């Protein structure tokens, strides 16, 4: 049995349960951790750009993403500058702890990883 942070930290793994969450049109919540996850290891020179799409990706174009107004109004001034980017980590948080008690579990017995663990056999 894969744990929860090996399915996120692999690419591969992460990308297998994004199509498992795109089953029922929640992929976003994956995409949204991967962003996260890139936007806190990102050199400061890619900050804009990247606070730039992330809201674009995950509260334009999807609404899937669902934050207290506390959270979006900070993600509001994220946006101009008036505010760092810890507001993205802690989404990601929220995010991660959705993903790891609601879908995992059911990720776990799915035909997509029934097929990985054949594909994955050293494990």
């Given at each position: 049995?894969?744990?929860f942070e090996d399915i996120m930290?692999?690419?591969?793994?992460?990308?297998?349960?994004?199509?498992?969450?795109?089953?029922?049109?929640?992929?976003?919540?994956?995409?949204?951790?991967?962003?996260?996850?890139?936007?806190?290891n990102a050199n400061k020179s890619?900050?804009?750009?990247?606070?730039?799409?992330?809201?674009?990706?995950?509260?334009?174009?999807?609404?899937?993403?669902?934050?207290?107004?506390?959270?979006?109004?900070?993600?509001?001034?994220?946006?101009?500058?008036?505010?760092?980017?810890?507001?993205?980590?802690?989404?990601?948080?929220?995010?991660?702890?959705?993903?790891?008690?609601?879908?995992?579990?059911?990720?776990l017995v799915s035909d997509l990883?029934?097929?990985?663990?054949?594909?994955?056999?050293?494990?």
């Amino acid at each position: 049995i894969l744990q929860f942070e090996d399915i996120m930290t692999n690419p591969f793994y992460r990308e297998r349960f994004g199509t498992y969450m795109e089953r029922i049109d929640k992929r976003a919540l994956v995409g949204f951790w991967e962003s996260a996850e890139h936007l806190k290891n990102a050199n400061k020179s890619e900050i804009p750009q990247l606070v730039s799409e992330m809201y674009q990706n995950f509260f334009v174009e999807s609404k899937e993403i669902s934050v207290e107004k506390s959270l979006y109004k900070e993600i509001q001034q994220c946006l101009v500058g008036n505010r760092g980017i810890e507001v993205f980590s802690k989404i990601q948080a929220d995010v991660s702890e959705v993903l790891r008690e609601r879908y995992y579990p059911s990720f776990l017995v799915s035909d997509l990883y029934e097929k990985l663990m054949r594909l994955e056999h050293h494990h």
